[PDB]
Amino acid sequence: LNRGDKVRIKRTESYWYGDVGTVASVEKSGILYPVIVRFDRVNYNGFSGSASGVNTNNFAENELELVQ
Amino acid sequence: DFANLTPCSENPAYLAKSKNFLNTTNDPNSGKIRAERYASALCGPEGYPHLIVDGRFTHAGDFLIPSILFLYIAGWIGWVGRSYLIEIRESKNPEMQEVVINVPLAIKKMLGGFLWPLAAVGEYTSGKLVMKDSEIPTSPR
Amino acid sequence: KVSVDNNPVPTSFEKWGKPGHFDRTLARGPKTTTWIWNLHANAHDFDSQTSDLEDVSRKIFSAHFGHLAVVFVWLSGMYFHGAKFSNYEGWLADPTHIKPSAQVVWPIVGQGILNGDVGGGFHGIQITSGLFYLWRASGFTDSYQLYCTAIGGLVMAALMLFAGWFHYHVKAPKLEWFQNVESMMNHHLAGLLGLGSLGWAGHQIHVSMPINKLLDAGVAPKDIPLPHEFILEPSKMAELYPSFAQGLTPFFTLNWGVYSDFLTFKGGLNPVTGGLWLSDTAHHHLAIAVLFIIAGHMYRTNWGIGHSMKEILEAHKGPFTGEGHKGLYEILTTSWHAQLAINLALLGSLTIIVAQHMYAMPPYPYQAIDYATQLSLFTHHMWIGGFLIVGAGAHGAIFMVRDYDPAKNVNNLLDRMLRHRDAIISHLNWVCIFLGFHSFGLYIHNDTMRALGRPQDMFSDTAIQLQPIFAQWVQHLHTLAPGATAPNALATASYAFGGETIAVAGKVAMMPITLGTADFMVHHIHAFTIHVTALILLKGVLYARSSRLVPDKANLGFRFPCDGPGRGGTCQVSGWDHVFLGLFWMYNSLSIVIFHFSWKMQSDVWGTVSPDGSVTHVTLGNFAQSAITINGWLRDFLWAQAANVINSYGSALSAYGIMFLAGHFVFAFSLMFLFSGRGYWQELIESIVWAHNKLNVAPAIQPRALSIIQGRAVGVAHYLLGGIVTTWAFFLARSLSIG
Amino acid sequence: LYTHHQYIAGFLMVGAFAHGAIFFVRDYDPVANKDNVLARMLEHKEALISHLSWVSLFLGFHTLGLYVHNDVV
Amino acid sequence: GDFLVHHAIALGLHTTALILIKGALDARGSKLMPDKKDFGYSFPCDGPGRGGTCDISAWDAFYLAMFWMLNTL
Amino acid sequence: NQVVQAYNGDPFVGHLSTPISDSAFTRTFIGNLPAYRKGLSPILRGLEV
Amino acid sequence: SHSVKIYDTCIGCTQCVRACPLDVLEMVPWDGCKAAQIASSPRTEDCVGCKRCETACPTDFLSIRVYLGAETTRSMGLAY
Amino acid sequence: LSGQPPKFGGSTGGLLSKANREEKYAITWTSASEQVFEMPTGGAAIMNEGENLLYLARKEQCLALGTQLRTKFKPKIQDYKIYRVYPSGEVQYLHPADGVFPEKVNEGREAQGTKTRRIGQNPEPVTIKFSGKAPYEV
Amino acid sequence: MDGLKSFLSTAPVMIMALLTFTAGILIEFNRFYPDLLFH
């Protein structure tokens, strides 16, 4: 996986499960979830009445399916 | 068939009501032309015209003609909105254009709805009408 | 004292196309559909878009000007409808047989049936506002004068729009201009209320008194002189009133006794029209004018005389309140929300006082003739007053969470208010429970004893009796007033306390309102519901900052749904949710108030007086024995008097039947938002979103469900809308069916 | 008798679905129930929930529309 | 007159069924709360976070469909 | 001349020393009801209540 | 007492440990993220269940979970 | 528990009988400057010069007080200690349990309450049937 | 002036213009041909 790559989420937990997202970074420091995938769609986050959630999550390498 | 309903021409109750139909418009003959219009319908003992929604073509104007008319001028609304929403999803800010409607594009799409059933069968045979089950986001299952 | 900033904001169209420019959380763009609701809910929260106290004041000033433009547009609409689309030219000739109608309906789908025969050949909706009685009292004679008033109002609305644009965009006043509240109340008392009352006293002396005295004499409106013909030739006014031959030289020398010809403290009601005399009405406005102009020279201003509010407040300290009010002037001059709380409380109580006085002392000619106008006006102003009192509670809570810092006020009245919130809410809980047990429990006891066949055990007037002895004593004092405790009052203040049944045109204008045990029980229900509304709103105001449950409500805000499911569940701890519950309780309280009024006037006041002198009432004295059980309210009031609103189909009153059913629908619909929660609707919207995604029509603006506060707000809005529309239809169809 | 048994029937049907939900929470094993009819109930729940949404909205819009139309005219 | 009330009855049956199966199938979790099996059947809510989560449990779908059952009957 | 102090000189207990709750007459009267009177056996205070 | 569990998806953003009113949570060192810290819940018998920690968590779905359970005096917030 | 109490006039919001039957909480902070703070019980008080000792009935009230001591004062008071005192007499020490506030990593704390999985790999209630446990704690 | 263009193009103004247009054509069709229960 590299920057700018479109990937499909298979987390089974995430709001963007089955949704596509541009990869924003890959981390090499040996962490559990090193790939920062950022989406057009915002999730369910924040207090009630908040106008938006967050469009970013950290996914592992195995969860992503490359579609580009 | 349909012995329970007599046509409103040979009905006592409907004649009793049609002596006193009101005027719905400024025109003073609106009640008379309405009584002449409903005389060809089927009405029960109450004297009010009933509609027949079997699809029998002797009563096709009761339901099937408004059925076709609504389906056309609502598939118009659905297809136009779908085509506009699909179009604005490649403009680098698809969310603001739902707020401020791009009216040249909107009017072009709205006058694109003459040929929606042909566009519908075209997009269904070419696969743009639906999406695959895996390609769409979904809940945990 | 006038210092302004010139052209503080350019007048440009560019911010119009970018919604949400005002709030920094919306200036990014709409990610979800919650952005729309936030765009509307934060549009007038001027105190949260910025925190300068100067620009919010300029925003408030120009918003007031735009609102006055709206009010003048509405008032121009009223006068234009009375000018063109009305039978005012016909009703003025015969205001005892034909009825007002200021709205004709275009016939499109058969709604020309709403153009019912209102009288004189005119066809249209019979109006229930007292606009025609207002214009008869103010001296209108022809439709051209109403047309001129409508055109002048539209011009004044354009002037208010221009003034709002002027005072935001080219010359906006500074903060020190707004904090001159002593000069402000000098001008609002002396110049707004005082000179307004003086100008209206002058109008009533010179227009209302001649036109209405000749119309009482029996002169046709076509033969009525135009109101300036009584000014250009004062000889005509000398023909009518003999005290105008002496001029103003009795006034300036304090020979005021010769003005008793028309400035009289007569009291009572005019027998030929049913309204108040405009003699004591003009005298009343003159006295109010003098008193207000005198009171407008109280507070200190540029000159050394006057009486500064700060020292007045600091002078008032006792042993119980400690440091006293020294701290309150900085509260009300640095916070628009405390000002809005006090002004909303007093405007709501004033609207309720207006409602309670304009039935018992009907100030307009022929207002007490028709019961549609009286019932509609009482009901309308009760609803407006209750809404404004709930707003007072709301902005008390907003002030406590937002504009109240305890650094600048230690041990003053507001601090000591907050230091014993448990005692206040405790004793108000006790009085609410006490009155709810002893006001509704008497109704349940009567209802059970009537069901059990024990009518001697009931709380009737022919049973265990609960007489309102203090209100009966006060009625006795006001009947015995115009001889001893008001010597120069010829008649009683109103006939509601006692006296003679005033019958004009065969219908009862005003007759004494007797208070039996039914009135005792209903008034204690009134006290109970008013106390519970005060409990909810006062609890919101006191507990807005912090409670024992959530000690940090102040920084969670004002509109927050909950703190979470913990501590058992803190589901409605905000002050906003206390407003939300006080809206339901205000609806309950005012609906009981207007049901009490409608039934008491239908059974004990309104009716037809026969020429033999006997009075027969609209529901024939039901209230004495039926208004003590709940079954009597459900059977003799709601079931019996809705026969006029549900049998109204196929007639002119069929719009009220439609509106009756519509109000029921909106009530039942509101229960969807009130009873449900956000979670169900979000996971249902997700399945609908899936159905859109399957065929590529999913929106880019993500459809969130309504938020928790949004769901509660729309539930209470539809609840009050449905209930008020149902009661509006019920009252305005009962009343047009009784005369 | 009619109203009594129809109310009991409504209560029992709502309880049947309540215990369907309690089964899906507690006693449902998605490993043993792999690709059978229950797993495929849960594997397309959005489709049939959206179609119940459509049919209830459709039918409600037009029953209230016909009732309000008859009522207004 | 029986046509419209049968369609109202069908509307009530379909909407009660919609709420009941929306509690039955979403008892294991939707995107608002992907774990509801661990909170159980009748937990109150999940906090004011995630937008607000007031009646998300399957027990609350029982609750709403109880209202709709009473209406339909 | 303050008449509302804190209860018993403790400013953090949830009570005020108001002229009704903690006056001299209230102390001598509430504190001399049978439920609070000193030295009585429970039988006589229950009998008087 | 309620149990506050922190999962592997924590990014050490500290938002939960300062959103908590009762300061049940605290940050401990960790080797599984860039921030080199993970939230822990040591004094979890003081958790009232307010779920302001879940509200402040940015990771999706949730790196911190509150599981409401056996109520006590501390976990019900009773001043009496 | 050293410290003179704040100059507070007393209030009805405060210590009920829970304080003298079970635990009540004391917050102790030291400030150089005398100023005015909002007690979470309702009202406003006077911060004494030097040490203060405020007795409250809930831990949330003590932490809310400490929060407003931290954020609402420009000379931030961060040396505030929250105790839990029992009517039997012994005093516990609660909020700055280690040296530093919980937001900062002390590097000597222990990761408890941490699961070795995400929520997706949480066990499901059908496996743990009649086990006396619940799907988180397995 | 591009601001009035972008304000007349907003969702509420355009939806109210659209609803007013559809209401106008429906009302005019009811004004000319009043009572059409069927074909």
Ligand code: CLA
């Ligand atoms: C034009 C866009 C668009 C189109 C093509 C669809 C199409 C679909 N919707 Mg709908 N829907 C939309 C807008 C759209 N919807 C909006 C705006 C709402 C919010 C109220 C919804 C909410 C909604 C619900 C709640 C459900 C559907 C469902 C459905 C399906 C059945 C048709 C139906 O029930 O209509 C119903 C339509 C409505 C209730 C509202 C329609 C609103 C207007 C009339 C549509 C046009 C919107 C906009 C003005 C177009 C822009 C024009 C352009 C020039 C800018 C179908 C896949 C159903 C489903 O699940 O299918 C299985 C269902 O349950 N929709």
Ligand code: CLA
């Ligand atoms: C003198 C009048 C006065 C003034 C000017 C204010 C001003 C304000 N109030 Mg308000 N308020 C008042 C009266 C007043 N209020 C009354 C009488 C109530 C009691 C109900 C309240 C209750 C109250 C609450 C509870 C809140 C405010 C808030 C606000 C602020 C923002 C309002 C906003 O953005 O709404 C924008 C406008 C709307 C959202 C429109 C609402 C739609 C209405 C309710 C329904 C439709 C009404 C209509 C008659 C029905 C016909 C429509 C349809 C059928 C066709 C602002 C400071 C808010 C605030 O500051 O909190 C931070 C807040 O939350 N107000």
Ligand code: CLA
């Ligand atoms: C008919 C419906 C109903 C009834 C009975 C109540 C009852 C009450 N509400 Mg209310 N409420 C209602 C609907 C109702 N509400 C709704 C729709 C809402 C809108 C959201 C609210 C919102 C609400 C709030 C926000 C508040 C209340 C409060 C109160 C209490 C006021 C105290 C009182 O009246 O004394 C008690 C009187 C009664 C319960 C009615 C008389 C019944 C008889 C006398 C008692 C029965 C006799 C006997 C004991 C039966 C025993 C039989 C044996 C077999 C056991 C009371 C418990 C207020 C409160 O708690 O004040 C302290 C409060 O703050 N209400």
Ligand SMILES: CC1=C(C/C=C(\C)CCC[C@H](C)CCC[C@H](C)CCCC(C)C)C(=O)c2ccccc2C1=O
């Ligand atoms: C139905 C419902 C929803 C779903 C509501 C949604 C999705 C809003 C739908 C609004 C539609 C789009 C209509 C918007 C307003 C209309 C234009 C108003 C028409 C009124 C005219 C007659 C004046 C919630 O989100 C919710 C949240 C919290 C508690 C209860 C509920 C709740 O009951």
Ligand code: SF4
């Ligand atoms: S989210 Fe809803 S149910 Fe949960 S605590 Fe808040 S208001 Fe109550």
Ligand code: SF4
């Ligand atoms: S808020 Fe969530 S992501 Fe941030 S430190 Fe706490 S558990 Fe980790």
Ligand code: SF4
């Ligand atoms: S539930 Fe509340 S008190 Fe408990 S750990 Fe989370 S934020 Fe802290």
